[PDB]
């Protein structure tokens with residue numbers, strides 16, 4: 001067959017044809033041709049063996065991108081001023097502004113420091129369009145998981161691409177970057193953007209490009225595709241390049257040999273932005289410049305070897321690198337424990353996947369091995385005993401952060417927006433295309449602030465179950481054991497599921513007591529900068545815990561949600577000790593909870609001018625990130641109907657303008673939050689032998705989390721009574737305090 005006239009169409013001649021070993025004899029010959037390169041000069045401003053031409057040129061659409069610069073005294077896009085775009089400016093027949101995605105492997109957010117002397121083109125877009133300081137990628141910080149994330153709006157665990165390599169026990173087969181297995185669709189869940197477009201009437205350019213097609217041919221092909229007639233022309237495109245990833249691996253992020261690759265990339269953007277101008281589309285198309293992950297210093301010698309910890313190490317399969325994954329070849333607890341805290345300077349930590357910090361959302365897929373290692377930034381982990389950079393580490397590490405830039409009619413003009421996570425982009429790009437997004441993990445409306453106009457105006461979820469407000473019904477003999485002004489500053493959480501619960505009023509605190517789970521869903525109370533279990537007479541004993549259960553539990557103890565130690569008058573403390581405030585806690589936990597309630601809260605209140613605290617339980621025995629229903633709960637207090645949480649949370653809110661007391665706050669809010677794993681021992685904190693001042697705060701930071709995360713795990717809805725706009729609040733709720 002032949003590719004005569006078929007090159008990079010939509011025996012094959014399309015841009016994946018190599019990747020499948022199946023292009024026509026003359027594909028290379030007719031389609032990949034390089035003579036005289038890709039930049040016009042005077043000498044040739046007057047064939048068919050060339051790569052781009054300099055007169056069926058603009059007409060047939062294979063000019064070199066510089067043509068009108070070189071041959072018609074037009075200024076490079078780069079050289080023109082920054083002109084705002086009040087509305088898109090498209091040729092007729094363009095029913096909507098096209099979207100072009102310029103993605104780059106391994107582009108670290110700080111590379112943008114390097115400046116317009118190396119990356120002027122890329123720098124015009126940032127300066128001129130919409131940008132943020134950096135973008136958070138997903139764990140694991142590797143190419144294939146983050147690209148599909150970007151394409152889906154989903155965490156890998158949901159989309160199924162949980163690593164560059166993976167084994168699916170139900171399929172019995174392994175996925176690799178090199179190989180033909182990846183091509184099988186069965187690996188791929190969610191709905192990538194190209195599929196969402198197609199289902200809704202919008203044609204898609206190809207999102208993948210074979211290795212062989214040089215970067216310059218990829219841009220020409222995209223620009224060519226924009227010249228097609230109305231009913232064949234796609235409205236969305238992606239360019240992809242494997243830079244800066246490739247050279248960062250060889251030279252390391254802080255290599256000065258990184259200037260050149262950043263130069264090369266900035267030239268390709270230039271081609272593209274020149275190329276658009278040439279077609280008069282440079283004020284039509286929205287462009288997204290976007291990375292998949294950062295890059296970090298990593299050298300051969302900083303490799304831990306499992307062989308140093310384990311006896312039978314030939315008994316295991318390790319996915320190695322900047323993360324570890326272990327399973328059996330053909331005792332889990334003994335391997336975990338054989339790797340728990342054996343050196344003072346150990347550069348990794350083992351986890352039962354369900355024990356990894358929830359913000360990672362990395363456990364709910366059968367391709368995620370129970371045994372997981374978090375390697376330390378700058379380190380490697382191998383099985384047994386060239387490059388200077390790598391990545392894949394925890395996605396809260398600064399070296400792993402990456403880039404976003406929006407530039408176009410729909411985007412905003414010279415606007416800076418706070419950093420955000422790549423799971424939010426899907427919704428946006430759907431907005432930019434008037435497409436209904438498929439269900440995903442982005443919170444729609446969190447990134448409306450990036451856009452001139454918004455077709456999507458978010459609304460608050462309807463409350464599902466209404467609260468009860470009980471008064472004194474019962475009398476203490478009936479049992480058998482053994483204010484909103486001050487404590488509820490953003491309205492009560494809305495319960496987004498079916499149960500029965502009560503609101504409880506007190507001098508020091510308010511709560512949301514569950515007659516089903518026998519404990520508060522939440523407990524809110526406020527602490528200023530300068531600052532025995534008895535029955536609760538409003539709750540039927542049938543829906544009340546008992547101390548008999550606890551006395552009878554060999555392991556389980558109990559704690560309070562609102563702390564006794566922060567009481568306001570000896571009178572008031574009697575409330576701290578109500579059965580309605582009491583929850584199950586392992587003593588290994590209590591140390592942690594106690595430090596938080598009795599040291600760290602008053603400290604947080606000194607540092608931020610008061611804080612509003614809402615704490616509560618979380619149950620996620622299935623580790624799917626969602627609030628558990630009863631059937632799922634696998635553990636109660638001995639002989640009782642009293643369920644044991646998997647984690648506990650707190651939400652800590654104040655005033656961004658810290659000159660204002662957390663309760664006399666008129667403006668934006670400052671929020672931090674955690675989800676602490678509820679475990680029988682403190683194996684996880686290698687320094688937990690010591691005073692709590694030497695390891696708790698470290699553990700807590702590791703388990704920082706977004707309020708949104710808390711909402712999923714609770715089906716509560718927070719912050720519904722403020723003076724801020726709802727889209728701002730979504731922002732507030734998507735925010736993660738990273739401590740990096």
Ligand SMILES: *[C@@H]1O[C@H](CO)[C@@H](O[C@@H]2O[C@H](CO)[C@@H](O)[C@H](O)[C@H]2NC(C)=O)[C@H](O)[C@H]1NC(C)=O
Pocket residue numbers: 154155158189190361439440441624625626712
């Ligand atoms: C991320 O979003 C995905 C899709 O919204 C969620 O997964 C869906 O879970 C719903 C239950 O709400 C199920 O009906 C579907 O089976 C799931 N679909 C897919 C494609 O996985 C997932 O729950 C979200 N993750 C978190 C932690 O919120």
Ligand SMILES: O=C1NC(=O)N2Cc3c(c4ccccc4n3Cc3ccc(F)cc3)C[C@@H]12
Pocket residue numbers: 101103143144145147148150151207208209210238239240242
């Ligand atoms: O090496 C590649 N060559 C190529 O054309 N590549 C795009 C590519 C890759 C990928 C892996 C998983 C899921 C989607 C993927 N894409 C498509 C894509 C491109 C840009 C995006 F913003 C999102 C997805 C790999 C990458």
Ligand SMILES: CCCCC/C=C\C/C=C\C/C=C\C/C=C/CCCC(=O)O
Pocket residue numbers: 019020182183185188192195208209210211
């Ligand atoms: C619902 C999904 C619809 C189909 C698309 C889904 C998954 C991707 C399908 C095809 C493209 C995927 C990988 C192509 C490979 C690109 C890099 C070159 C491969 C190689 O180096 O040889």
Ligand SMILES: [Ca+2]
Pocket residue numbers: 550551552553554555556557
């Ligand atoms: Ca006990």
Ligand SMILES: [Ca+2]
Pocket residue numbers: 619620621622623624625626627628629632
């Ligand atoms: Ca669950």
Ligand SMILES: [Zn+2]
Pocket residue numbers: 106143245249391
């Ligand atoms: Zn890489």
